[PDB]
Each structure stands twice: as structure tokens, then as C-alpha cells.
Design a binder for this molecule. Structure first.
Ligand code: MG
Length: 220
């Protein structure tokens, strides 16, 4: 039986996309550009701050200095850190808390494998810190998803091999990263999005210890 579960944060444990979105929108408004709505934001999700800022400026054909670019990027980070101060246990996705408790009680290791620079803060605010055996630090990992590096680190950090682990993700790049680590992916979302070769559940309320065990037993 699997010895650990490696969690992404965004789309699995909670929604942090909402808060990047508002921070980009508050920046764009602040400098009198818009078009920064939830559709356009599809172009900003999981892309570099640099890339996000370019695309926003192109909305108004706006030109900036290097110092101005740097200040806008910082402003957005500031905005984001202000906006997540509201995060609470209320923001934990369905089934996630019960899953963590059942994993812990069965002595299965729990690790976070997230690019979030605020993972430890967010998990504290959601009252989930105690369940986690480790949080992979993205500042200490060489390559971002879909590279496997983050999931390897999260497994290693709790004393297991990725081939002893299940990884939970909602993104194409995240699923691929789990696969290349050697871990077994269980997706949350749409096969249209994440592939036909893996077990996908429609939402997080399907992520149960029972379900995870049945999938493990039925794997490759
Ligand atoms: Mg995710």
C-alpha cells in the first residue's frame, strides 16, 4: 500500500488562482488598464510574473522602464500578500480535511508539492499545518512543473520514494510531473483536460482514503 500522498495546493487543497487574479486586476486598474477579467486571466495562470506583466501592458500598448516594470511586479506581489490575509479553514476544498485526518491516522505521510511561495502561511491559516509531514520548498527545487523535481523533493522530504506515493493534481503540467516522478496520479477535474490514461475524479469530495486505496490496488 502507498506510504505517502503528495498534494498540490491550488485546485486540490484550496483556490489561490482567485487571489492572483484579483492582484493582477487591482494592478491593471491601479494603472488605468483593463480587460483583466477571468477569461483573459487564463493567459496569466501558471506563467512567469514577467510574462503576466507584458500581456497586461499590451492591453493598453503601455511602455515602461526597467525600474517601472520592477515596481509593478513588486506591487502585484504586495497585492497578493494583502489579499491572502483573509484565507481561513472556510477555504479548504471539500473532503480535503477528512482525507488528511484519515491519512494521518493510518500513518501515511502527507507532503506539499506546490510552487506557492506562501504554502506554509496558507496551510497555517487553513489550520492544516499539523497534518503535513513536509512542504517542498520551491526555492530549493531546480525546475518547475511539468518537471518531476518538486514531487521528488516532497516524497524524499518525508523519507519515501515517489514510487511509494500518490500525487493529487488538477493541472496537465502537475499530472505529467507526478508521472515522471514515478508516483501514481489521481486527477481532480475533466479527462478532456488531464488525459484518458489516469483515474480522474470530478471534485475533491471523491478523494477518500477508501477510494485512494482502491485505485492503488488496481494500478499498473
Ligand atoms: Mg494544482
Amino acid at each position: 500500500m502507498f506510504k505517502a500522498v503528495l498534494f498540490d495546493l491550488d485546485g486540490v487543497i484550496t483556490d489561490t488562482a482567485e487571489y492572483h487574479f484579483r492582484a493582477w486586476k487591482a494592478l491593471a486598474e491601479e494603472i488605468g488598464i483593463n480587460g483583466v477579467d477571468r477569461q483573459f486571466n487564463e493567459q496569466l495562470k501558471g506563467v512567469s510574473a514577467e510574462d503576466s506583466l507584458q500581456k497586461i501592458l499590451d492591453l493598453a500598448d503601455k511602455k515602461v522602464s526597467a525600474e517601472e516594470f520592477k515596481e509593478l511586479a513588486k506591487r502585484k506581489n504586495d497585492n497578493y500578500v494583502k489579499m491572502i490575509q483573509d484565507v481561513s479553514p472556510a477555504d479548504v476544498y471539500p473532503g480535503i480535511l477528512q482525507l488528511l485526518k484519515d491519512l494521518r491516522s493510518n500513518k501515511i505521510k502527507i507532503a506539499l508539492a506546490s510552487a506557492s511561495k506562501n504554502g506554509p502561511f496558507l496551510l497555517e491559516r487553513m489550520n492544516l499545518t499539523g497534518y503535513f509531514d513536509a512542504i517542498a520548498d520551491p526555492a530549493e527545487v531546480a525546475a518547475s512543473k511539468p518537471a518531476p523535481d518538486i514531487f521528488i523533493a516532497a516524497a524524499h522530504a518525508v523519507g519515501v520514494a515517489p514510487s511509494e506515493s500518490i500525487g493529487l493534481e488538477d493541472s496537465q503540467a502537475g499530472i505529467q510531473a507526478i508521472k515522471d516522478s514515478g508516483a501514481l496520479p489521481i486527477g481532480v477535474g475533466r479527462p478532456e483536460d488531464l488525459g484518458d490514461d489516469i483515474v480522474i475524479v470530478p471534485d475533491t469530495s471523491h478523494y477518500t482514503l477508501e477510494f485512494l486505496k482502491e485505485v492503488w490496488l488496481q494500478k499498473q
